[PDB]
């Protein structure tokens, strides 16, 4: 349980005879507290005094109308109570006469007027007040203060600002008006001299006329482009709605369409001598908000060189390249440059490569190759990438040793020699010499003599006066090459 | 958007077929910003109007013949206007995140060739035989620059001013030497000037009224208390003496006349009273206010109390019937 505590206390007032004064008091607590209004310790009961409760249960407004003086001049108290406790706060009403209005006292130059608004439309109650000091304008509805203290909601409180010798303008702006907004509005002007009320004004909320205000929207939004420099382009922007909007073109911040001449619903920007790429904004505005839309204008140069190609696969006759596009914008396709490492002639070019990976086939075994990649877009062909060096894989030899010869040294030894095969397809790790007295045997059942890389060897421990058939192959790290056709040597 | 609704406080009237130029209320009236410091701040001024007798608002197409309607800064120009141009106009100021907007009525008014129109002339008051008072043709600023010089025909009522006893036209100024009550009334200037090969006319009328000199000005004058006639009669007190107060003209004067019977006139009980009143303006507009009172029942004693009459109008004076 909790005692009463004021959330709103009344402030001293100075009003004018015949006019109105209101005092506001609000309290919270548990149980919800009650309020009484007293004067000189006696509960008010008076022909000109009215008490208006807040719907939410948080208070009461004491309204005095028409003011009489000195009758009503007094200290009054708001007393909030529940079963846990009681608290009061005092406040003063002073009431002058028109023949005692000081210079500067607020006046109502113009007051709110009967207004009828359609539901969901904005209703604005208006007031013009003057005085010295510049008065504050506040608003009442059905004798209770308009709560605009939160400037977030449906109802907004506006005020013009003080160009000295003027009336200060107040607006009560009721957005999205609804039936509950109907009622009797009064504007109240206050300064240090006192408070004056306007005459009351009724607001009515009416069902809609069928005509509908349509927010702005792009009928033909501005679509992007790309063109060579200078280089002209006409970009069309179209907005529609009810009411019809204005259309101004914009380069981000600076205005492109001259304000005093701003076309209606359709503005097409003509771009003479295009140079640098840009974002162009098309703004459209009716009375129902502002909308925007961009057109991308770019000029592409010959593509930046692709990323340096990387060898990711290799065979004896092929090399597979992969590369980064090296470009911010899409590339149409690529060109691969290729040549033997020690070729001093221009690169051969493989054209129309539509991906960032390609296998260059047609290559020779155990050969050094140099590759570059070139990018191409709709503008043209860019600079070549930095080159990559690599080497195709080895194979077994694909040709036999040449000019295989053998001659007798002794009745037991021969001298076998040969020349390197024309197609080694790699580093010759050595040779294998096959020999026998019976050449009808499978070569794997011939006698064999392994030799490293060389072109001549001796073979001993042969039996004299015999015909020996001799075959020679070369081998790389991959495997054996083909055997030379049989030659014969006699011991 | 911040809406200020209609601004009827400034009801605007402009003659048919003549250059008007309408400034936008919000800019200096409500908002604290010139067009300059608001245009520089990325904001855009846009105009919409609803023709009176129509529901829907239109924007105004500036790209139209002879730029009949144009826009310059916070002002929107009509060169000339048309009868059709009459309606409620809305001007708007908006960032993407901002919107203030206000409305105001505009009334295009017809103009008979004797300058009799539905318009509201202002009133100039010249002191009588206080030498020269010059009238200046009003509302002519900024319709044309120094580069051009206009030709202003002046009129009195409906007749062109050519040769006069004391009235001299000096173009944009009208010279009244020795102003006499003989010349009172609404005076019209038609300032004419060319713009881009076409001639434009501006028509304005000021009602000038000659009043009395503040050298002739002095405290109230009362003579019904002169005492040449004392009013003793059989009671029978059907007799009341007038109260004649003549006031020399004073530009700001507070004319109050009050009968003081016993010192507390406020409806004394013995008799049933109601205060009665009268007023009369002279040729040079000095006042005579006269007061006499009426009774239901008559008590014989009042003759023995004296009736003093006073009145103050920026000066306090007082005499009694005796
Ligand atoms: C752009 O508009 C101008 C306007 O005169 C026209 O002459 C030109 O041919 C247009 N160019 C294109 C590409 O449409
Ligand atoms: C245009 O705007 C986009 C943002 O949507 C940005 O990524 C692009 O770089 C801009 N282009 C230019 C030329 O400013
Ligand atoms: C309006 O006057 C000038 C522009 O003409 C500018 O320097 C000045 O700051 C403006 N006034 C205010 C209050 O900003
Ligand atoms: C009214 O406006 C129409 C066009 O909307 C124009 O043709 C006509 O001259 C105007 N009428 C008058 C009497 O000014
Ligand atoms: C302006 O609008 C009001 C409605 O608020 C209407 O009654 C009035 O006739 C209109 N006047 C003009 C000149 O458009
Ligand atoms: C629009 O104008 C207001 C007031 O000058 C300013 O506070 C706001 O930041 C502006 N917004 C933009 C996007 O320029
Ligand atoms: C001009 O003054 C005359 C009196 O001479 C009178 O008709 C009226 O007050 C004025 N006329 C108009 C059209 O206002």
Author numbering:
A (entry chain A): 28 to 518
B (entry chain B): 24 to 345
Article, verbatim:
To structurally explain these differences between IL1RAPL1 and IL-1RAcP, we also determined the crystal structure of IL-1RAcP-ECD in complex with PTPδ containing three Ig domains and two Fn domains (Ig1-Fn2) at 3.25 Å resolution. Similarly to the PTPδIL1RAPL1 complex, the Ig1-Fn2 domains of PTPδ bind to IL-1RAcP-ECD at a ratio of 1:1. The Ig1-Fn2 domains of PTPδ exhibit an elongated shape with a length of 160 Å along the longest axis. The Ig1–Ig3 domains of IL-1RAcP are arranged in an L-shape similar to those of IL1RAPL1, except that the relative orientation between the Ig1 and Ig2–Ig3 domains is changed by 20 degree. Correspondingly, the Ig3 domain of IL-1RAcP does not interact with PTPδ in contrast to that of IL1RAPL1. The interface between the IL-1RAcP Ig1 and PTPδ Ig2 domains comprises both hydrophobic and hydrophilic interactions with a buried surface area of 726 Å2. Although Arg196 of PTPδ is positioned in close proximity to Asp30 of IL-1RAcP, no observed electron density of its side chain guanidino group indicates that the interaction between Arg196 of PTPδ and Asp30 of IL-1RAcP is substantially weak. Basically, meA does not extensively interact with IL-1RAcP in the PTPδ Ig1-Fn2IL-1RAcP-ECD complex, consistent with the finding that the variation of meA does not affect the affinity for IL-1RAcP. The interface between the IL-1RAcP Ig1 and PTPδ Ig3 domains buries a surface area of 906 Å2. Therefore, the interface mediated by PTPδ Ig3 is more critically important for binding to IL-1RAcP than for binding to IL1RAPL1, consistent with the finding that PTPδ Ig3 is essential for binding to IL-1RAcP but not to IL1RAPL1.
Vertebrate type-IIa RPTPs comprise LAR, PTPσ and PTPδ, which share common domain architecture with a single transmembrane (TM) helix flanked by a large extracellular domain (ECD) and cytoplasmic tandem PTP domains: the membrane-proximal PTP domain (D1) is catalytically active, whereas the membrane-distal PTP domain (D2) is inactive. In mammals, presynaptic type-IIa RPTPs form trans-synaptic adhesion by specifically binding to their cognate postsynaptic organizers through their ECDs for inducing synaptic differentiation of neurons. To date, five different types of postsynaptic organizers for type-IIa RPTPs have been reported: interleukin-1 receptor (IL-1R) accessory protein (IL-1RAcP)7, IL-1RAcP-like-1 (IL1RAPL1)8, neurotrophin receptor tyrosine kinase C (TrkC), netrin-G ligand-3 (NGL-3)1011 and Slit- and Trk-like (Slitrk) family proteins. To elucidate the structural basis for decoding the ‘splice-insert signaling code' in the type-IIa RPTPs, we determined the crystal structures of PTPδ-ECD in complex with IL-1RAcP-ECD and IL1RAPL1-ECD.
